[model samples]
Target chain A: LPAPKNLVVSEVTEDSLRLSWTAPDAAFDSFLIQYQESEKVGEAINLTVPGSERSYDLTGLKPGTEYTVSIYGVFMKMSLSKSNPLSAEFTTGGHHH
Target chain B: PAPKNLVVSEVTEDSLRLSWTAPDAAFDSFLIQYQESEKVGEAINLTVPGSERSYDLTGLKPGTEYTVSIYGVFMKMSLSKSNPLSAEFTTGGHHH
Candidate 1:
């Protein structure tokens, strides 16, 4: 009945990041995760996870880049907002670990 | 000044962490308030000392909705509290 909450960047590295969230008591079809570099030329990347999952590891990113993430809970022909989506932002490791 | 970038993390069945930045002005302390989303009446309030940037919120319920608010206190300047920043979140747990 509602979007996931408490979206968090649990970990970050030179080329990957970990995302986690809390699902609503209301069940959904799946979860959509999208990310793109903030104010950069990077195109958004979209991925899906089973509704039962609470965490996802996103990879193939560049080091020293800042990215923002948007997460949604899907229900067949719709998404959550109940409309305002959940978001989190993080910067990858800069220069080195 | 008010707080900014109120972010939540380390969320579990019974506890979570909230962090924020005091961007609008330098603050002497922080006042935090939280409540279950659907509950009525007063929110539980607590104070952080000397600009501590984050807090670990505990004794929460799984599968429940919650809201948090943060206000900066300019104690040295003789102020009560500043405008607040707020956020909403749910705790981790599932229905049977």
Candidate 2:
């Protein structure tokens, strides 16, 4: 299976960051997104979306923090294919929310 | 900059120990992420103090190939992080 490619992160604000990526041509049931903030005191957050969706926005972020995200293609049991997640990183703005 | 001389020891059926040398022990923190090489989306991530140099990764599956990465955190001076150092290891057990 071909993994998601060309992951892009944009619209970085004090409390959120927008994400966009190129989904693989293969079939999948959904998408999974996991993100963890660096040098912080919080656990990683995970999100899932239907395969119909291609983009997402990460919210409730701390100001002046760096975040790492890993996105994956989810397939149901007995599905024909699967793929690994593509990872991207972004830093939030310095101002408070 | 990244850590060097990443060492993997104490291999077992379910765990592997890791250690490394840092250019400077004064860095803010260390973040480690690892997952099986054949799959993704379930990587284990850990953060340790700057003074800590080794980790005992456990609860692993036998006869699996895992890849691990380490990153260094720098304070607000430049909003920069050191490049990650990555390596691969295979757990010892259940060879078929």
Candidate 3:
């Protein structure tokens, strides 16, 4: 399986961020997105998107909070396959306007 | 803004997972209403904390399609809601 590449932040707001990346291949099943606050000890939120999509909008964030986001291309089933996840860090906007 | 990019996962015979992104602000909680396809039966309701963006629906019939709606509740009122989302899965065959 091929990994996701060039994970980048396309946009950010007080409570949301838009992410974009390039997939190594088009045959994977889905993309798994994992994200959480950088300083807090808590469960990270996980989300899955279709294999054909290359961008995602992440929401429900705390204002001005720093976070780490990661993504993986997965082929799920009886026998599963996954690529090395791409990760990055970003901070939300200062506050709601 | 309303919820966006609603999705369903972990689908099994009698249970499935539902999730979505929160809007740009906080809410008091979330309310989820769901039912069998085509409104064939009474709807089921679920609620979770404002911080939550996902839930698991259980006790579903095998190989059935379900319709669901989600909302963000703030201060005892509905702040935003998602367009209805739907999914279907057939349960695994019974094992003795």
- Which candidate achieves the best TM-score against the true structure? 2
CAPRI grade of model 3: incorrect
Write candidate 2's Cα lDDT for B1-96 as tens digits.
566666675667677787876767545677778887778698888778778788888877766777777777555422211122111112222323
Where is the poorest 10-residue window by lDDT in model 1 chain B?
B77-86
Estimate, for each residue in A1-97, the C-alpha lDDT of model 2 and write its tens digit. 5456656664666677777777645454677777776543488787888877777888877766666777777655431111122222211223322
Give the per-residue lDDT digits (tens) of candidate 1, residues A48-94. 78878888887877666667777877765422111121223322212
**Off by more than 4 A, model 2:** A1-97, B77-96
Q: How would you encode candidate 1's per-residue C-alpha lDDT over B1-96 as one tens digit per residue? A: 467777875676677687777654366667777877778785798878645877898877776667777777654312121121112222223312
Write down the TM-score for model 1: 0.39
Instruction: Quote fnat for model 2.
Output: 0.00
State which docking tier applies to candidate 2: incorrect
Whole-model alpha-carbon lDDT for candidate 1? 0.64
DockQ for every model, please: 0.02, 0.01, 0.01
Candidate 2 vs 3: which has more TM-score: 2
Fnat values, one per model, are 0.00, 0.00, 0.00
